[PDB]
């Protein structure tokens, strides 16, 4: 209700900061203001200046606009700022929204990294399968984000962190006696299982909690848990975070009431009405480049490419098919007058993004009457619900305790053993960027010819 | 003598005769008052209460009407628990017990329909589902072995679990020998209603344990679940308010015989012209469905089978809009709403005491296979289900694996792609058709929700 | 080849004995000669006289022919013979065929008892399920029959005898030290498993042999074996044995070469061309009475009623449906001039009876190539044999030993888990009583509306 | 360089060039003699024998003919194992090894067809079936790692079992380190051809055991069976007698390139005009089938797929009436029967190195699932087989249960009612059609027996 009004000012101020921030740099012309590289630049110089590191001036690579007339080009700058100047400049304009502002931006960077980086190597060190990456969302986010940052973390990310802890704790066992890292550890386990939906997944992590002395036996349980999160996906916060270069243009777009939703339409409309432009290295198909940016903003890296393609009306391609590199231009290649292009993929349609990093619906109808007791004697089909009884046998009635790994494993087999059923989210329809309040459902479909997995290979 | 229809007849008639003199005592005489089921309900409460360990009374209804239409007002009179019992036993005679048990069975059947016992299921540790196996959990122990008839599998498993629990907290009843055999009779009553060998075996293990260890409660829970797959035997009977039984002489004849499991009751229901008090927001149609289900104990029965016989579409307890038949003091007003219960039977089928599921059970117990003599081709006659009786049920064996047997039983029945039929060959007959001389081939309404208490979908 | 010629004289002589035997009794008129009761009578007086019992004169109930003109009637006699007179009289006419003769008759009595008696009570003492009766064939046959008698014994019969032994051996353990009953016991185990076809059934009984000290653990194995013999039936000898009253008429039928087969056509033709007549008690439908007799002669008690009905062209009914009592008329009811009737069920068709008390054919094709190894790359069904691999996993490769009860149990489940397949004996066709040498196959079918099990109930 | 077709070309041509000078040495010059595959077989024996550790020779055939028709007579000449080897290496050059290995691979492929190895399978403890996994068990170790290519799963499991057995009877080869790593390379070669995770895992357990206990042989046997369900990778190549390779220059051209796995070999087979000596009771047709199967290593291949490509009906080894291509001394006569091998290809498909079964294996190894962002309906993209790779195959786990994993794998594939397809989308092309520009949609001959060595039915 009034929360949107709160979030609105939060993002607007971030934009204001970007404006005055670029003004310091001496970058004015809109070609520079809208460049997402310049955004990332001040976003680095900011986050760095607001965090103790260990001179004492943080710089970054910026891009100016060289005319040459004809077409347009950009050149690398790399100026420097002063941490304290930036630190005060930020808090002044930000005010009480200072903290949530930094957390926002960081959630953006993490959502962009999930897209622009395959973390499978990091997945091998704690190692689970190089797959399961879909559960590894938000593994690059700093500890600073706190409870708000852990909200975007995938089930696999927490499992990785937990395992990491349990391992270092076996070497130096004084970590359990710390009470500081001890609570941090216990909270990881309490964070996970908050995201976990399925009871069998809760039971497991619960068992992991029940052990006062962590050991390899727990790592086995967590690994088996991480894998079950692919069949039954945990709840990860999915939010729209855009470079502050766009937030800066909120006033200049000029048509608004006062309110904003990063979980909803407000951000959707803002993305389209914006005019982001990015730098391009060698190769770098502008169309694919735009795809990365879209997925970034929407943290759609692990989302179904089919669902995206339906909303944007354009074809999304797996990372393999996509020809282009990351948004950050490495020092190795930086030249004068390198090309740039808008991010061209807009939303023909839209849907509210909801919590729930994943959802499996059509779940067995239960807790109600699951069967019938015949009274009249007459021939009849014998109504019964199969998927429901496999729920009882598999899940934890009250008593006797149980064998967890078994039920958690059985829950996975029983999931794949029913016909073929992919229906979830049912009842939810896609809408149109012109439609607010969702008065007109779009009934058509999602494309079945496109590969589902962005990182899918082989 | 299979003339019992005659005896059962005298049983319901005397009940109705009592209802009449009870109403007359209350000072309410008219068809609108008599046919009103609330007055019947009230009279039944004053009865059951007066026959059980100063003076009591229920809330009755008198008929006050705008010139065009009829309305009712709450009364709540009272009389002595003695005159009530004496008046009852006098007129009732040797059928007094059978009468109380009958009426009592009715209240339970209605109760299962009107109320959601999914709560009490949790209290005993059982799942929220399985409610279909929970039939007759509100019925007093007064009904005795005749009452347990309407008791479902879950109900007994529940009664056992709660006892085993009370035995752990407090020992001292084994040695008691009263509640000890009382506990065992529950296990014997169970397995009587259990069809599948695995189940009758799983209860055996529980019986064979002198001390109720963890292995017992562990089994009972698995047994509870299995009863939702292979359904136990719950006696199903047609019970109507004595206000209807009072009109039997006025409705004329019957055959002079009456059967609550047969066609006699089927006709009596349709012939009857019952009226129920309507509360606020009560849909007469939906309300009439509850009365239908309450009379036939149709609660856990398939709604499709019900939608057929009645020729109308039965709604789930969720979509169904109405409240219980009893009027809470919180809402009671002068001259409130009332309506006739409009749902009747187009067709009828016998009331089954079984859970029958898919036929061909027990394996036949006779010769299960053939040992060839002549050499020539032929399709190997064998009974596949008859062996699962011998393997699961142990004669000289134990194996301790009984749990795994039940599990494998359910899972295998789960394996069949789509398979089921119940009472195959049993046909429905028009309410005008008795003697079952003209079966009708109509099938049922595949578009209608199956379970009355089904939800979450 | 020449064996038939040997069996021919064997049966003929038995008939000759019956003739001269009845002559002693003073029973001449054909109405008496053809009576199967009179046959049974001298068959009792014979078997009794040829076996040491412990006065010293064996009698029996016989039936004379009272005229009354009009219709015909029979009356009970009960004369007596002398064992030694009968004993010498038999060996004289019998000669070298003496022994095989007694064994034959005994195989007949046992085949009639299987039909006319439900042994389920005897099945409960050793007790297995009251079903399994189909494997209990030939449980009434005396020890005298030896190896020839044990040939008609069902798998259940041996299992019963074995269990009986193991039990009495646990009470008095000196039975193992006897070396007499010890070999008798060991031979029971070696007899069984000779009848057993399936390897899993051999493995089990083998394990039972491997135990020097018999115990309850073995009884469990044998019980589980007995039950598996219903799914996979052992091999029991099925022979045609007729009352010697009919054998006596072999010369009087008058059309023969010299040879006979109780396993084949010769006996088939003899049954039909005969004219047996039996006594009838109260009730006793003559049609059903004939059915018992037919089944008796052919030891068809456990055979499929459908298969019988096809050959005889008449409807066979389960014992429950059949209205009539046993052939033996108890002392309690014996009167003067009680009714009699022919046994009227003949063979419209015939088939050679073969060993194999039971057969399950269509067995998984194996020991040959069970699968394919692709060379060319092209789309194709992927030919494979499912029922064959369940054979390997279930049965005993060489090494490691194994868990027998498991494989023996799995073999049963795997048998019922394949579609529905009842085809066995395939390729074998029924023939006609006029056809010898089987030159003309009968192609039509067996009736599917008739109950299969004679003793089937509930 | 994927120009290798050029190299392989020079390899077979030189082989043929050797066959020519070998025949010339034998003094037999004519097309009837040259095209005769028996003379090719003989020359190959004198070669393989001369290249392996005084003088040797095979039984050759000279052409003697009635004026109307052609006949052949046995010869059996001999020369020095030295001149043979020198003559061979001179003309063969750097391809000498590849040449010997090629010819050697041929003999094995033919061997699998002509002979029943179901015996040797018993000697190693394996089932009589699984013969389809026994491919290339007669091939010498001389062929090295290139030879193991044609070796089947069972063949390796057999080689392992026999070693483990010889290690038990006699220790002393672990410490040997020669036959020790030689044993291990068999386990590594295995699991390379194994597709399913459960299998590659089951062999891992065997490798991880320093001492070959009972757990090993126990697994290998289970592994052997599993290869009849999920078929390992056996390299399939087209090998023809050098007598055909000698006509390559006369047949003209080719492209100047040659590939034994490709179309080049397909054409060469049909272009070739091979003749085989016929023994008594030999059906020319049936005999021609053996030659076809021997060349394409079609032995364990589906006969239906074979019946299609050739446009003729392939009979099983049972119904098929004929004997091996080699003439035993017991039956050899002057001027005996001979016939052209008449079975050709109407269509052709590439030679696959796989066992492919049903596609969609390995799970993809990439992103296996989707984590939703927008709220809206969509069919839950997930890879069911990709998880069975993670569950069965353990990264940080062991569980010791690997045996149960294989079992459950097979049983689940057994569960599907009727399901299979191989190389779905792969089409057969006319022998006139190269470049695969015109796929044909014809299906295959469902009335024909599947397995060549199938029996008992």
UniProtKB/TrEMBL annotation, chains A, C:
Pfam families: Flu_NP. GO terms for biological process: symbiont entry into host cell; viral penetration into host nucleus. Late in virus-infected cells, may be cleaved from a 56-kDa protein to a 53-kDa protein by a cellular caspase. This cleavage might be a marker for the onset of apoptosis in infected cells or have a specific function in virus host interaction. One of its GO terms (cellular component) is viral nucleocapsid. Belongs to the influenza viruses nucleoprotein family. Homomultimerizes to form the nucleocapsid. May bind host exportin-1/XPO1. Binds to viral genomic RNA. Protein-RNA contacts are mediated by a combination of electrostatic interactions between positively charged residues and the phosphate backbone and planar interactions between aromatic side chains and bases. This is Nucleoprotein. It comes from Influenza B virus.
UniProtKB/TrEMBL annotation, chains B, D:
Keywords: Capsid protein, Helical capsid protein, Host nucleus, Host-virus interaction, Ribonucleoprotein, RNA-binding, Viral nucleoprotein, Viral penetration into host nucleus, Virion, Virus entry into host cell. The keyword RNA-binding applies. GO terms for molecular function: RNA binding; structural molecule activity. One of its GO terms (biological process) is symbiont entry into host cell. Late in virus-infected cells, may be cleaved from a 56-kDa protein to a 53-kDa protein by a cellular caspase. This cleavage might be a marker for the onset of apoptosis in infected cells or have a specific function in virus host interaction. Its main location: virion. It is found in: Virion; Host nucleus. The keyword Transmembrane does not apply. One of its GO terms (cellular component) is ribonucleoprotein complex. Homomultimerizes to form the nucleocapsid. May bind host exportin-1/XPO1. Binds to viral genomic RNA. Protein-RNA contacts are mediated by a combination of electrostatic interactions between positively charged residues and the phosphate backbone and planar interactions between aromatic side chains and bases. Belongs to the influenza viruses nucleoprotein family. Encapsidates the negative strand viral RNA, protecting it from nucleases. The encapsidated genomic RNA is termed the ribonucleoprotein (RNP) and serves as template for transcription and replication. The RNP needs to be localized in the host nucleus to start an infectious cycle, but is too large to diffuse through the nuclear pore complex. NP comprises at least 2 nuclear localization signals that are responsible for the active RNP import into the nucleus through cellular importin alpha/beta pathway. This is Nucleoprotein. It comes from Influenza B virus. The gene is NP.
């Amino acid at each position: 209700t009034e929360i949107k009004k709160s979030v609105y000012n939060m993002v607007v101020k971030l934009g204001e900061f970007y404006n005055q921030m670029m003004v310091k740099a001496g970058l004015n012309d809109d070609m520079e203001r809208n460049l997402i590289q310049n955004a990332h630049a001040v976003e680095r110089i900011l986050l760095a200046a607001t965090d103790d590191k260990k001179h004492n001036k943080t710089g970054g690579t910026f891009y100016k606009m060289v005319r040459d007339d004809k077409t347009i080009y950009f050149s690398p700058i790399r100026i420097t700022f002063l941490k304290e100047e930036v630190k005060t400049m930020y808090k002044t304009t930000m005010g009480s929204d200072g903290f949530s502002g930094l957390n926002h931006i960081m959630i953006g960077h993490s959502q962009m990294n999930d897209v622009c980086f395959q973390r499978s190597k990091a997945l091998k060190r704690v190692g689970l399968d190089p797959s399961l990456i879909s559960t590894f969302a938000g593994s690059t986010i700093p500890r600073r984000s706190g409870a708000t940052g852990v909200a975007i973390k995938g089930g696999g990310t927490l499992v990785a962190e937990a395992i990491r802890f349990i391992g270092r704790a076996m070497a130096d066992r004084g970590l359990l006696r710390d009470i500081k890292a001890k609570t941090a550890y216990e909270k990881i386990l309490l964070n996970l299982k908050n995201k976990c939906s399925a009871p069998q997944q809760k039971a497991l992590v619960d068992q992991v909690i029940g052990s006062r002395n962590p050991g390899i036996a727990d790592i086995e349980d967590l690994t088996l848990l991480a894998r079950s999160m692919v069949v039954v996906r945990p709840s990860v916060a999915s939010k729209v975070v855009l470079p502050i270069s766009i937030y800066a243009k909120i006033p200049q777009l000029g048509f608004n009431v006062e309110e904003y939703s990063m979980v909803g339409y407000e951000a959707m409309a803002l993305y389209n009405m914006a005019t982001p432009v990015s730098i391009l290295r060698m190769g770098d198909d502008a169309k694919d480049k735009s795809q990365l940016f879209f997925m970034s903003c929407f943290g759609a890296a692990y989302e179904d490419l089919r669902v995206l393609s339906a909303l944007t009306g354009t074809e999304f391609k797996p990372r393999s098919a996509l020809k282009c590199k990351g948004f950050h231009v490495p020092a190795k290649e930086q030249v004068e007058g390198m090309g740039a292009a808008l991010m061209s993929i807009k939303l023909q349609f839209w849907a509210p993004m909801t919590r729930s990093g994943g959802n499996e619906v059509g779940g067995d109808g239960g807790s109600g009457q699951i069967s019938c007791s015949p009274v009249f004697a007459v021939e009849r089909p014998i109504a019964l619900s199969k998927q429901a009884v496999r729920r009882m046998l598999s899940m934890n009635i009250e008593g006797r305790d149980a064998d967890v790994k078994g039920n958690l494993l059985k829950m996975m087999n029983d999931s794949m053993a029913k016909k073929t059923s992919g229906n979830a989210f049912i009842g939810k329809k896609m809408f149109q960027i012109s439609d607010k309040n969702k008065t007109n459902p779009v009934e058509i479909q999602i494309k079945q010819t496109i590969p589902n997995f962005f990182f899918g290979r082989d």
